[PDB]
Write a protein that binds this DNA or RNA. Structure first.
Ligand SMILES: OC[C@H]1O[C@H](O[C@H]2[C@H](O)[C@@H](O)[C@@H](O)O[C@@H]2CO)[C@H](O)[C@@H](O)[C@@H]1O
Ligand SMILES: OC[C@H]1O[C@H](O[C@H]2[C@H](O)[C@@H](O)[C@@H](O)O[C@@H]2CO)[C@H](O)[C@@H](O)[C@@H]1O
Lengths: 437, 437
DNA sequence: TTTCCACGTGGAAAA
DNA sequence: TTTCCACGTGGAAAA
C-alpha cells in the first residue's frame, strides 16, 4: 500500500484498542474532512521496515519504543518536532524512550509493564515467589485446574524471570549501551530459564502455550494466574473472572524485572501527510478525550499524557503495573534490539521444547544477539566475488573445450574437461578425482 | 506438541466457533473424564503437514476438505471407519468430499459457500451483477461510503468471479481430475480477474484489503457489501448493521461460481486417542446438541448431519448459502490443491498490486498450479549429484596442490591452481580466464 | 526424464 | 577484516 495525500492510515498491534483509536480517527474526519483508517496487520513491526524502505507502509505506525531506533537508523521515520508547550504535556522519561541520537523519532503514548494477574476465587492469596508455584500447581491440579499459564512463544513474557537473578540484554555503562556486552548467558539468566524449563519438565506448564491459549485458559477460569499487560484487562472484565493485578513473584529472593515498553507512534518518513499526522497525534489522540476513547477499548497502561494519567493512576491496577515497572527497566531503542529479541525467542523456545539444553540455548543466544549484521555492500561484495570466480572458471573451460581437441564425449561436465587437461600435463586422475603424477 | 493418550487436542481455524467446540469438549470431559483442548493456531493448514510427518501435531484437525487429500497422500491421517448406521446420518455428498482413493479420511461437518452480504439500510436492493458495482460505488462515495469490500489476500474470495466466465482449477473428465489440465489462464479467468483489477484501478477497491479490514468496514457500516461465509454472521449480528445474505452477482450474465468447502475433521495418524477421537466426533460433535453448541458460536453453514440441517435449512441465510453452493462446485481434495491455491493467491495479489499484468500473473499461475512437486528422492538424487561433482573437483585440486610444485602463493583459490595446470599443458590464461594455446 | 552450471549466503580459516 | 569452497535447488538444455 501507499500513503496518499489527504488520507491517514495507521498500523497498531491487534492486542491494542484499535476500535477506540478508529473512533478518534472518526472525530478527526468530522472536524477536518481527512479520512483515517486504522489497521492491525500481523507482524507489523516486521512488515513496516520491509515496505517503508521503498516508500510504502502506513502514515503512522504504533509499537513499543524498542523497535524505533532501528527504523530511524534505516531512515524510515520522520523527525518529530513538537513545540515546547506540547512536550511539557508528557512525562520527560517517556520522551527519553523515543529519543535516538539526539532526535525525537516518535510520540510516546503509554507505559506498559507486565504484572501478575490472578483469579481471586481460585486463589485469594497469590504467591509471592516463583519457587512456591510448583506446589501450588499440584494442589490446583487435584481440583481440575492449573497454577499458571502465560505466553511462552514471545520472550517478552519470560524476560522478567530471566532478568530476576541477573540476566540482562545490553549492559549500560558510561551513558551508553554496549552492543557487544550481552547478559543472556550469565548465571542469573541460566537460573531463570532453568526454573522455567523445570516447570515444563515437571508438567506445570506446556512448552507450546502461546498468547491465545493462556488468555483463553485464564478467562475461562481454568488457570489461576497469568502474566500479561494492561491491554488484556478488558477481555477479563467481559469474562466471569474475579481477577487481581499485583507484583510479579520473586525469584531467588529478587524481584522479577520486566522490560518496560512505551507504546509510541512513529510517522512514516515517506508520508505526504506529516503535518496531518502531527495534528492528529498531538491534538486528537494525545488528549484526555482521545486517550480515553482508546483506553476504554483496551487499557493503555500509564499514559504519557500527564493530565489524563492523573486520573488513570487512581486505578490500583495501574499502581500495580507501575510497581512492576519500577522493578524493571526501560527497554533500549537501539537498532540491535531486534537481534536480541529474536535470539532470546529462539533460546526460550528451544530450551522449553528440549531441543537444546538451557546452557546451549543461551550460549547461542549470546553470540547471536551480539552478531553484527553484514551491510548491503558487504553482501554485494561477496555476491560479486563469487560471480567473478565462476565467470573466470567458465571462460577457462570454454577455451579448453574449443581448442583442447580432447577426446571428450558429446556431453560431459567440466570435471571431465579438467581430467583431460590433467592427463595432457602428465597426470593420472582416477574416477573419484584422486590425482597424481 | 505431541499427542498424549488419554487427552484430546483439537486444531480449528480462528474464524470458526472454537468456543462452542470447546463447550462440546467440556461435556465430553464430564461424561468420560477425558480432557479436550481446542486451539486455533495461525496457518494450521500449513503447520499440520510439517509437524504430523514426525508424529507431532494435534489429535484432530479441522479444515475444509480440499487440504485433506494431500494429508492422506503423506500418511498423516487415520482411515475413518464409521459404521454404515452412522454414515446414513450425513448427506452422501458430504462423505464424497472426504473420500480419497476409495477411503474416508475425515468426518464431514458442514458445507460452506460464499454469499453476497449487504447492508439493507444503505442498499435496499443489492446489485444483481458485478458490472453495476462501479456506478453503485460512485454513488456511495458521494455519501462517504463504498460499495464493496472483501478479502483480496485469499484467492478463495476472488475465485467465484474468476470462475464465472469459465475459469476452472482442474478439469474433470471420465471420473477423474486431470492435474495437467488447469484453467486459470483461459479467457474466462482473465475476464474475471481483469474486472477485479479494473475495480482497483478505478479506486472502487484497494489492493491491500484483507479479511479484518473488510469485516471491520462492513460491520461498522462504512461499506455496503461484503463477500463472506456463514462463520462471519455472528459478528455482524452483534454489530448495528441490518444485513441480508443473497446470491452473488453475475458476471457477463453468468453466476459467480464459488468453490464449495466441506469443513471436515481428520484424525492424526500418530494419535494414540483414535478411538476417543472417533467417540468425540461421532457421539458428541456430530449430534444436534453438539453442532448447535458450535453453530451458536459461529454459524457452521449447512451441516452434514441430516437431523440438525433440517432445522438450519429453515434459515433464509442458509438457503442463500446453498443457492450459491448449487452455482459453484465442490472443491477437489487432490494433493495438488495446495499448489493450485498458492499459484492463484500469488496471481491475484500480483495483478491487484500492478506488479504483474493479469495475463502475466495468470500465465505463471497456470504453470505453477500444474507443476509437479519433485519427490524427496528426486531432490536427494540432485543433492547427491552436485555433492559428488564438488567432491571429484576438490580431490583433483588437492592432488594438484600437493604434487604440482606449481610455485603458488601461500593462499590462492582453485582458479589459480587451474591456471598453473593450464600453462603446464602449454596454455595461456588471461586475467579473466580467456584461455588459448 | 536426467544432467549441468549458476546462484547468493554460510561458516571455516587466516590474518 | 577478507577469502574461499560448500551447500541444495533453479532453470536451461538435450533427449
Ligand atoms: O517478545 C518480544 C517482543 O517484546 C515486546 O513486544 C511486546 C509489546 O511491547 C507489547 O505491547 C505487547 O504487544 O506484547 C509484545 C510481546 O508479544 C517488544 O516491544 C518487541 O519488540 C519484541 O519483539
Ligand atoms: O484462499 C485459499 C484457501 O481457500 C479455502 O480456505 C477457506 C476455508 O475453506 C474457509 O473455511 C474460510 O476459513 O476461508 C478460507 C480462506 O481464507 C481452502 O479451504 C484453503 O485450503 C485455501 O488455502
Amino acid at each position: 500500500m501507499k500513503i496518499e495525500e489527504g488520507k491517514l492510515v495507521i498500523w497498531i498491534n491487534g492486542d491494542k484498542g484499535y476500535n477506540g483509536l478508529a473512533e478518534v480517527g472518526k472525530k478527526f474526519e468530522k472536524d477536518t474532512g481527512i479520512k483515517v483508517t486504522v489497521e492491525h496487520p500481523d507482524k507489523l513491526e516486521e512488515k513496516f521496515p520491509q515496505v517503508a524502505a521503498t516508500g510504502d507502509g502506513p502514515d503512522i505506525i504504533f509499537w513499543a519504543h524498542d523497535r524505533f531506533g532501528g527504523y530511524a537508523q534505516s531512515g524510515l521515520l520522520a523527525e518529530i518536532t513538537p513545540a515546547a508547550a506540547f512536550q511539557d504535556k508528557l512525562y520527560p522519561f517517556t520522551w527519553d524512550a523515543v529519543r535516538y541520537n539526539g532526535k525525537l523519532i516518535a510520540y510516546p503514548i503509554a507505559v506498559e509493564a507486565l504484572s501478575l494477574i490472578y483469579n481471586k476465587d481460585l486463589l485469594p492469596n497469590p504467591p509471592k515467589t516463583w519457587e512456591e508455584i510448583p506446589a501450588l500447581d499440584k494442589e490446583l491440579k487435584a481440583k481440575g485446574k492449573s497454577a499458571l499459564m502465560f505466553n511462552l512463544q514471545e520472550p517478552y513474557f519470560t524476560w522478567p524471570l530471566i532478568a530476576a537473578d541477573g540476566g540482562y540484554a545490553f549492559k549500560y555503562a558510561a551513558g551508553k549501551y554496549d552492543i557487544k556486552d550481552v547478559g543472556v548467558d550469565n548465571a542469573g539468566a541460566k537460573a531463570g530459564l532453568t526454573f522455567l524449563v523445570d516447570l515444563i519438565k515437571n508438567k506445570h506448564m506446556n512448552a507450546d502455550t502461546d498468547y491465545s491459549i493462556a488468555e483463553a485458559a485464564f478467562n475461562k477460569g481454568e488457570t489461576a494466574m497469568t502474566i500479561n499487560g494492561p491491554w488484556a484487562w478488558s477481555n477479563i472484565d467481559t469474562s466471569a473472572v474475579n481477577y487481581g493485578v499485583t507484583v510479579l513473584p520473586t525469584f531467588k529472593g529478587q524481584p522479577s524485572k520486566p522490560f518496560v515498553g512505551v507504546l509510541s507512534a512513529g510517522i512514516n518518513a515517506a508520508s505526504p501527510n506529516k503535518e496531518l499526522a502531527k495534528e492528529f497525534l498531538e491534538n486528537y489522540l494525545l488528549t484526555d478525550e482521545g486517550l480515553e476513547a482508546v483506553n476504554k477499548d483496551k487499557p493503555l497502561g500509564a499514559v504519557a499524557l500527564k493530565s489524563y494519567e492523573e486520573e488513570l493512576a487512581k486505578d490500583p491496577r495501574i499502581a500495580a503495573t507501575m510497581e512492576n515497572a519500577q522493578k524493571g527497566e526501560i527497554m533500549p531503542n537501539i537498532p540491535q534490539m531486534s537481534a536480541f529479541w529474536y535470539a532470546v525467542r529462539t533460546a526460550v523456545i528451544n530450551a522449553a521444547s528440549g531441543r537444546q539444553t538451557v546452557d546451549a540455548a543461551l550460549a547461542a543466544a549470546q553470540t547471536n544477539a551480539a552478531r553484527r549484521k553484514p551491510s548491503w555492500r558487504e553482501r554485494e561484495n561477496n555476491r560479486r566475488r563469487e560471480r567473478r570466480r565462476r565467470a573466470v572458471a567458465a571462460k577457462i573451460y570454454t577455451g579448453l573445450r574449443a581448442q583442447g581437441d580432447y577426446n571428450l564425449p558429446k556431453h560431459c561436465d567440466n570435471n571431465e574437461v579438467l581430467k583431460a587437461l590433467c592427463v595432457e600435463a602428465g597426470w593420472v586422475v582416477e574416477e573419484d578425482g584422486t590425482t597424481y603424477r
